[PDB]
Design a protein around this nucleic acid. Structure first.
Ligand SMILES: [Mg+2]
Ligand SMILES: [Mg+2]
Ligand SMILES: [Mg+2]
Lengths: 65, 110, 38, 131, 121, 145, 109
RNA sequence: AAACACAAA
RNA sequence: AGUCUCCCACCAAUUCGUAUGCGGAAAACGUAAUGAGAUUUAAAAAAAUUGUUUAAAUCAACUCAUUAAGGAGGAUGCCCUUGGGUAUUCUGCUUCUUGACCUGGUACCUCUAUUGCAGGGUACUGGUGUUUUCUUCGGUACUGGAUUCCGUUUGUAUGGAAUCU
């Protein structure tokens, strides 16, 4: 079970989630890059600051009085 | 003189002096707003684009992009001659009086 | 988790430039909380 | 042969919806959230149609085969590359990688089920009315 | 007779424009060297091999000078090609007192020889 | 807050002090005869101890006390004789004058120290070192003809 | 490079109709000489330009353009039902134009 | 260092 | 500077369809008129921020509770005494997108290729109906660049797909 039920809500563990799905990730990486899969360098670069955004709050909203 | 249109009562009640562009909310959420000549136009976007406009819209060669301007604030009049449904000999003199005869020439007409 | 951590490191070495940055500064949370905010 | 894949896909869709319900307000204006919400649409549209396999209880389908053939070639060779690139760019930043790796794993496990469904349905796809 | 000359048609898709310097008649020598070095360093990030150096008319002499500089200074293979460039010119034809700019404009073709100079890494 | 650092790039140049032998006058010939190599008895702690001794010998007690607060040799390899000395923005002049007043190594004599680039970050120092290394190859290729 | 006289007017589709901004056919990009710009000054459809201008000036056609302005839900349902068409060999993410239940929009450049 | 977090303190 | 809030895709609308003192896209946002209040209080004492961290003779400062936009008539006060201008208060009109959500019944049309029946839409009536998950849960959208193949006045004047980074 990648997710279980606990005290507050449901807990999802990244460990087993990516452990059980490993060969699928390998096949995905092989389908994306063929000759660069054997190499280990920087393919993905930093996101431009123009496209960079900011994080909002976790609440819904505050109504006017 | 045509009045302001009928959009949303809430937003229409806000202006009451300066009309709103059909992209007012978008520009206000993207660029800055100001109200000078009975209207509300854009001043400048949040991100600085001094050197960006030069390399994009200017006379430069290395310009890979485009710039879009909401220029709906520019008001226009359509004039038609109803003295007859034929050549506008009245509109000729009207334009020659309104602007210099540069406007009233064979090039801009033909 | 050891081979799992090796897989995560070989995955982070493609996106990030320093693979042992988050594990050293403790940014890889082992638990994902899923609950409506109360 | 089909029920296992359907159960796997609905189990993935449940986790997708559960984490979306919580990350809806945290990351509102985000580029990767667009792809994440775009994936859930296709997932649910395939899930409702293959749940209709049990909604009817007949021989499988007559035209929903064509519907599936239309809906399968929109995320496999069309929107897989950009999705993967954005799911890796959200990790390359370094701010939020804990859910980024999980999202990458979600995509990796979801595309495998789609490929399995394609390679299974090849025979009746080429048999019924097309391909 | 009043006649004006517009630039020549340039149809470059996305990357022919990047790794290409158009040497003007007023472009300085050192600025051209700097831009050529920047282009040479950015080519393999753009994904090309060479840098195009295009000049026509008066700037052909200093374009060939730019080429001869990197010929032996940095020991980089250069290629010189001779091409033809067609330019459209608006002329006024005789046919009261109007503005000089607002007259009958007729397009006329004019061919000029130019030099393209490619530099390898 | 930020600690204001200022790295110092120095080179060890060996003048061809030999009056009995005739020499070739050119650019790359003298560049090769001045950049021949560093001796084996060359390391980081042997150069740091020498510069620490010279600092106390030239400036004094307080001059060494104020300068030895952040005096470290970050990167140095004896194959190319290029070193990066970290110091404060206040004591950069002191370290430069000490590197100028460097007489000799305790066992190796006949050498000079040349400060080339001074900057407040290591990235620009590395970029300038790469540019200098690229420039060095040009005269070599030209003279090999 | 283009001359002074350049005015292109026609009747376009509502931009909400398109799903993605698909680029035009790019195959004759290499065969672009000055003869085409020379012929552009000669070949010009004045009739359609004047028709579009009169449609935009007249307040009757300008209001008739607002005859059937479909909503985002309408276009969404049309795109959802374009999934099941008669040609079951090509995937089309767009919706065809109709000469009866669709608005023709006059535009000027 | 800065900058980030329903962390951690 | 700060462990504060918000914008940085849209949606004739399960999408805060919010004409609510004014300005404002929003904001734990600015300000205006009146009345009251002090662990005996709506709430300060025995989310963020701040060394002291509002007041507690009067003033000054903080908190909360009311005042919807425009046009017309009458009364009062001021310069002015044909008349006109400003401020306050009472009657009262204009500002109009067949919309809380959800259940049941009736009436009409389409698909599944005869029917009773099975599902969706619209028009009407009746009702608090276990809407106790009192914090996110709706719809659509491949936004880097290069090249190649195929069909076209029988229909659409442009569409389909492929390889590499
Ligand atoms: Mg700071
Ligand atoms: Mg800080
Ligand atoms: Mg800060």
């Amino acid at each position: 079970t990648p997710s279980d039920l606990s005290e507050s809500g449901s807990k999802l563990n990244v460990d087993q989630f990516i452990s059980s799905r490993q060969f699928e990730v390998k096949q995905l990486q092989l389908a994306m890059h063929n000759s660069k899969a054997a190499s280990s360098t920087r393919i993905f670069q930093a996101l431009p600051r123009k496209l960079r955004r900011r994080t909002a709050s976790h609440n819904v909203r505050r109504i006017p009085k | 003189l045509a009045p302001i249109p009928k959009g949303r009562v809430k937003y229409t009640k806000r202006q009451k002096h300066f009309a709103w562009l059909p992209t007012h909310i978008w520009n206000a959420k993207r660029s800055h707003m100001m109200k000078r000549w009975g209207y509300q136009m854009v001043w400048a976007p949040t991100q600085k684009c001094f050197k960006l406009t030069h390399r994009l819209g200017g006379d430069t060669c290395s310009s890979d992009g485009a710039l879009c301007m909401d220029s709906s604030y520019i008001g226009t009049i359509i004039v038609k001659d109803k003295s007859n449904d034929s050549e506008g000999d009245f509109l000729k003199s009207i334009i020659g009086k309104l602007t210099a005869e540069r406007a009233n020439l064979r090039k801009y007409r033909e | 988790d050891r081979t799992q951590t090796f897989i995560k490191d070989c995955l982070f070495t493609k996106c990030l430039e320093d693979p042992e940055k988050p594990f050293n500064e403790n940014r890889f949370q082992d638990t994902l909380l899923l609950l409506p905010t109360d | 042969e089909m029920d296992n894949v359907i159960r796997s896909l609905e189990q993935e869709y449940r986790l997708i919806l559960l984490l979306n319900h919580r990350n809806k307000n945290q990351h509102r204006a985000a580029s990767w959230y667009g792809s994440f919400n775009e994936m859930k649409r296709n997932c649910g549209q395939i899930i409702t149609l293959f749940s209709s396999r049990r909604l009817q209880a007949k021989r499988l389908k007559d035209v929903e085969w064509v519907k599936l053939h239309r809906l399968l070639q929109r995320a496999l060779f069309r929107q897989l590359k950009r999705w993967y690139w954005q799911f890796n760019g959200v990790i390359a930043l370094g701010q939020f990688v804990t859910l980024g790796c999980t999202l990458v794993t979600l995509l990796a496990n979801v595309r495998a089920l789609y490929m399995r469904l394609w390679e299974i349905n090849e025979t009746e796809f080429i048999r019924c009315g097309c391909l | 007779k009043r006649v004006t000359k517009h630039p020549s048609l340039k149809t470059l898709t996305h990357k022919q424009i990047h790794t290409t310097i158009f040497v003007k008649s007023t472009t300085p020598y050192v600025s051209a060297l700097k831009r050529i070095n920047k282009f040479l360093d950015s080519v393999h990030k753009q994904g090309s091999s060479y840098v195009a150096v295009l000049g026509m008319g008066k700037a052909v002499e200093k374009t060939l000078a730019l080429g001869c500089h990197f010929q032996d200074q940095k020991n980089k293979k250069i290629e010189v090609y001779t091409k033809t460039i067609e330019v459209l010119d608006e002329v006024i034809t005789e046919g009261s007192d109007v503005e000089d700019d607002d007259k009958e404009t007729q397009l006329k073709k004019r061919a000029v020889s130019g030099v393209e100079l490619r530099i390898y890494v | 807050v930020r600690l204001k650092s200022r790295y110092i790039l120095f080179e060890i140049i060996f003048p061809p002090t030999d009056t009995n032998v005739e020499e070739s006058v050119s650019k790359a010939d003298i560049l090769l005869s001045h950049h021949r190599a560093s001796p084996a008895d060359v390391s980081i702690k042997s150069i740091l101890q020498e510069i620490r001794r010279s600092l106390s010998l030239n400036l004094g007690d307080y001059g060494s006390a104020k300068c030895n607060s952040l005096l470290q040799l970050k990167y140095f390899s004896n194959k190319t004789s290029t070193g990066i000395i970290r110091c404060h923005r206040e004591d950069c002049d002191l370290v430069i004058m000490a590197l100028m007043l460097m007489s000799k190594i305790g066992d190796v004599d006949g050498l000079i120290v040349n400060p080339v680039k001074v900057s407040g970050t290591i990235k620009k120092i590395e970029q300038f070192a790469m540019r200098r290394n690229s420039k060095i190859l040009n005269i070599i290729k030209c003279s090999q003809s | 490079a283009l001359p002074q006289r350049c005015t292109f007017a026609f009747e376009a589709i509502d931009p909400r109709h398109l799903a993605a901004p698909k680029k035009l056919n790019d195959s004759q990009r290499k065969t672009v000489n000055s003869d085409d710009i020379l012929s552009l000054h000669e070949n010009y459809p004045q009739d359609e330009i004047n028709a579009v201008f009169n449609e935009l000036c007249d307040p009757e056609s300008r209001t008739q353009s607002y005859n059937n302005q479909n909503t985002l839900k309408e276009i969404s349902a049309r795109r959802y039902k374009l999934l099941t068409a008669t040609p079951n060999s090509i995937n089309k993410t767009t919706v065809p134009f109709k000469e009866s239940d669709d608005p023709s929009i006059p535009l000027v450049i």
